[PDB]
Amino acid sequence: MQIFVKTLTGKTITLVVEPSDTIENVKAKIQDKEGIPPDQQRLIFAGKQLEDGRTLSDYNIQKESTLHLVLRLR
């Protein structure tokens, strides 16, 4: 299972994941790929704000889904 994360510049990160992976896990994988601190990362899928402790399957993120990194505002 893979997902795509688009960064704020539109760069695509491809990640190997499993349904149960937490969003926290995903943030760690993005840190490794791009050096973006997890505390600076805000993810959305299908307009939904994704919380660190919930899983990809909790959000119905599927094979080949795209997530966006969006502005950390405050």
Distance from CA of residue 7 to its chain's centroid? Answer: 9
Under the criterion CB under 5 A, does residue 37 sit at the interface with Zn ion? yes
64 near 4, Cβ under 8 Å?
A: yes
Q: Which of 3, 5, 13, 21 binds Zn ion (CB under 5 A)?
A: 21
Applying CB under 5 A, the span of 7-15, 30-38, 41-49, 53-61 interacting with Zn ion comes to 30-38
Q: Give the nearer residue to Zn ion in terms of CB position, either 21 or 23.
A: 21
Q: Does 19 bind Zn ion (CB under 5 A)?
A: no
**Token pair in block for residue 4:** 């795509």
CA dihedral 49, 47, 16, 73 (to 10 degrees): -50
Q: Which residues bind Zn ion (CB under 5 A)?
A: 18, 21, 25, 37, 39
